[PDB]
Amino acid sequence: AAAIGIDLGTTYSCVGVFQHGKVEIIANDQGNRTTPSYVAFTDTERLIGDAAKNQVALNPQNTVFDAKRLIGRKFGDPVVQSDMKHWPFQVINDGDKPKVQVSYKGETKAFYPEEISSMVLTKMKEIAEAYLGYPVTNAVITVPAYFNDSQRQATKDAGVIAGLNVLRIINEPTAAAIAYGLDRTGKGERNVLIFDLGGGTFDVSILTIDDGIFEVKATAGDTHLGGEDFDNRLVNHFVEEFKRKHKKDISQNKRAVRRLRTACERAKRTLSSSTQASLEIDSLFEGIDFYTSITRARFEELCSDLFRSTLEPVEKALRDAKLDKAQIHDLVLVGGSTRIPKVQKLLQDFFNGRDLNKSINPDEAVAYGAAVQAAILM
Ligand SMILES: Nc1ncnc2c1ncn2[C@@H]1O[C@H](COP(=O)(O)OP(=O)(O)O)[C@@H](O)[C@H]1O
Ligand SMILES: [Mg+2]
């Protein structure tokens, strides 16, 4: 019985297993090595992952996402109230506990955030099981370093609802450090900086590792900065461009904007390894095709202030840990947005030419570390 490592992410989740000496990051049924943290409810079925995200434009009120922003928080919580204003789905109050309310098979039903996340965890569990060819009952699940007891508990519960014995709940930055084998240094304190630019959040952590024991020395960043913000700059740019070429504003067509958003995210992803990208959407708005392109340099310009803003939390965390740039032994890249060449440059330049540990797919580093730790704990 291999136990599994699960990164239960805000925007994407990832599952790994350590067996026969190495970590396998397990692809899902569509061949994707990470899976959106999305759960959809329709007249006839419950969809999770890619199947949920791939119908988001068609079903906005009953496609749930961002459950991680609610998990283990009270309804009265100001982050909750505030985050609520921007979701297309209803959150409601059940004894100061938030529930996401949707319609499923024709009826209004309401779920706790840990219930939604348990459906994502079940999907990651079944992904793992399809590959291993047996049931998985033990898992290590990861959380942000700043998660309080009640968010850790609610995440553990999500695991238990999913039919997993949760061997441990560990910090995301520690799991990334474990992935790179930094946990096995000894006697001396090593200082490690995790730079984590994901889909919805930006986390900088400084850890000190001394004879295998981790200490979180500083944390910083921005809980609303991530790849979604870069998708948006691109969306706004192409909306303006559509207006220029056809004198038509797609702004208010919720469906056109979501399909444009989708095309942008995919274009963006291509710009991490190519210097130009094709954007081709059939019948975007009133039967008008939108066939166009964008360069890495143009996308960089559109995002230049957001990209730069990531170095301020780095300065802050260094200050709060009372360390200079030159006392950081290792720079680890985590999150899919750190595949962006400009971002790697900014961080490497900030650190005066220092290597970045980026050999492990950054959107997988946390799951990789969880999988290593799960095997150890077993
Ligand atoms: N090659 C790439 N270039 C730029 N962004 C990417 C790339 N691959 C994935 N992403 C982005 O990474 C983000 C998801 O990051 P990930 O670490 O998987 O999830 P999470 O933030 O939920 O932990 C998304 O915004 C996605 O578009
Ligand atoms: Mg992440």
Residue numbers in the entry: 4 to 381
Question: What are the paper's exact sentences on this?
Answer:
The 70-kDa heat shock proteins (Hsp70) are chaperones with central roles in processes that involve polypeptide remodeling events. We present the first crystal structures of four human Hsp70 isoforms, those of the NBDs of HSPA1L, HSPA2, HSPA5 and HSPA6.
Despite different nucleotides and divalent cations present during protein purification and crystallization these structures are highly similar to the crystal structure of HSPA1A and other previously determined Hsp70 NBDs.
